Swiss-Prot record:
Pathological condition linked to this protein in its record: Osteopetrosis, autosomal recessive 3: A rare genetic disease characterized by abnormally dense bone, due to defective resorption of immature bone. Osteopetrosis occurs in two forms: a severe autosomal recessive form occurring in utero, infancy, or childhood, and a benign autosomal dominant form occurring in adolescence or adulthood. Recessive osteopetrosis commonly manifests in early infancy with macrocephaly, feeding difficulties, evolving blindness and deafness, bone marrow failure, severe anemia, and hepatosplenomegaly.
Protein name (Swiss-Prot/TrEMBL): Carbonic anhydrase 2
Cofactors: Zn(2+); Co(2+)
Source organism per UniProt: Homo sapiens
Mutagenesis / variant outcome for changing residue 65 to Q: 2-fold decrease in enzyme efficiency, as determined by kcat/KM ratio, and efficiently inhibited by chlorzolamide
Length: 258
């Protein structure tokens, strides 16, 4: 009886195995744009993905991850609310069964069709494993996806999904450039939070971009063909793999723009 997104193992059940689910800095959260405040202390955000080297794509039964080689300082995120350098290790998405839902964070309660998470770990901790034991160990760059024109840069990901349909399947995925998934503007909201799936660790500095990228109905439809189940098992379409907004509690969301 593993955690998941269904009626009997979904988000409302996670707290039993992971009590931190009811913690003080859980994610995602609704971003109230009127309550968010411009923060002058935020430094310019730097997203340097020029030397990023992707390696493989994997269906882990919850979503699909595009993993990168993070043994050298290559694809890094810095600036903004961050102290130091954070290294890109993987990116994945959360999406819905319909275009009207799918994102984890919401903006004034608005849900987007999907949300892209580019996960980075703080290099001061030596490796990802040590980073997830720290309160400032991770930084996740979140980008909303809305349905409209296709995103050319996402098609290569869309086309390889047929090869990793079920849980446990992976495929070589080299030379993918994540710069093709970024919107024009880097304006963002930031707050301290957690991983949005078990183990729900509170080690994340969230940086959520205000400008969403547009993807086509056809591209998101292909996300919905993936399976939560493993090969040979009853088919459970991989849809609505998102966690709803959690209590903001004692936190303030800061904006990088006026
Ligand atoms: N959805 S997310 O908060 O980016 C996230 C959720 C789970 C995990 C991550 C990110 S991780 O740091 O790559 N390892 C995980 O288990
Ligand atoms: Zn995620």
């Amino acid at each position: 009886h593993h955690w998941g997104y269904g009626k009997h193992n979904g988000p409302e059940h996670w707290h039993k195995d992971f009590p931190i689910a009811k913690g003080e800095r859980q994610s995602p959260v609704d971003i109230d744009t009127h309550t968010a405040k411009y923060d002058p202390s935020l430094k310019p955000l730097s997203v340097s993905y020029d030397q990023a080297t992707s390696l493989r794509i994997l269906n882990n039964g919850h979503a699909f991850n595009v993993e990168f080689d993070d043994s050298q300082d290559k694809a890094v995120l810095k600036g903004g609310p961050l102290d130091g350098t954070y290294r890109l290790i993987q990116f994945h998405f959360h999406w819905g069964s319909l275009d009207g839902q799918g994102s984890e964070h919401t903006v004034d309660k608005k849900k987007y069709a999907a949300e892209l998470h580019l996960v980075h770990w703080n290099t001061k901790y030596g490796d990802f494993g040590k980073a997830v034991q720290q309160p400032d160990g991770l930084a996740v760059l979140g980008i909303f996806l809305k349905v409209g024109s296709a995103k050319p840069g996402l098609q290569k990901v869309v086309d390889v999904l047929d090869s990793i349909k079920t849980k446990g399947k992976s495929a070589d995925f080299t030379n993918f450039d994540p710069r093709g998934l970024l919107p024009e503007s880097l304006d963002y909201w930031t707050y301290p939070g957690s991983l949005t799936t078990p183990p729900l660790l509170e080690c994340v500095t969230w940086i959520v971009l205000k400008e969403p990228i547009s993807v086509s109905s056809e591209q998101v439809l292909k996300f919905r063909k993936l399976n939560f189940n493993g090969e040979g098992e009853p088919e459970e379409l991989m849809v609505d793999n998102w966690r709803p907004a959690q209590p903001l509690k004692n936190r303030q969301i800061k904006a990088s723009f006026k």
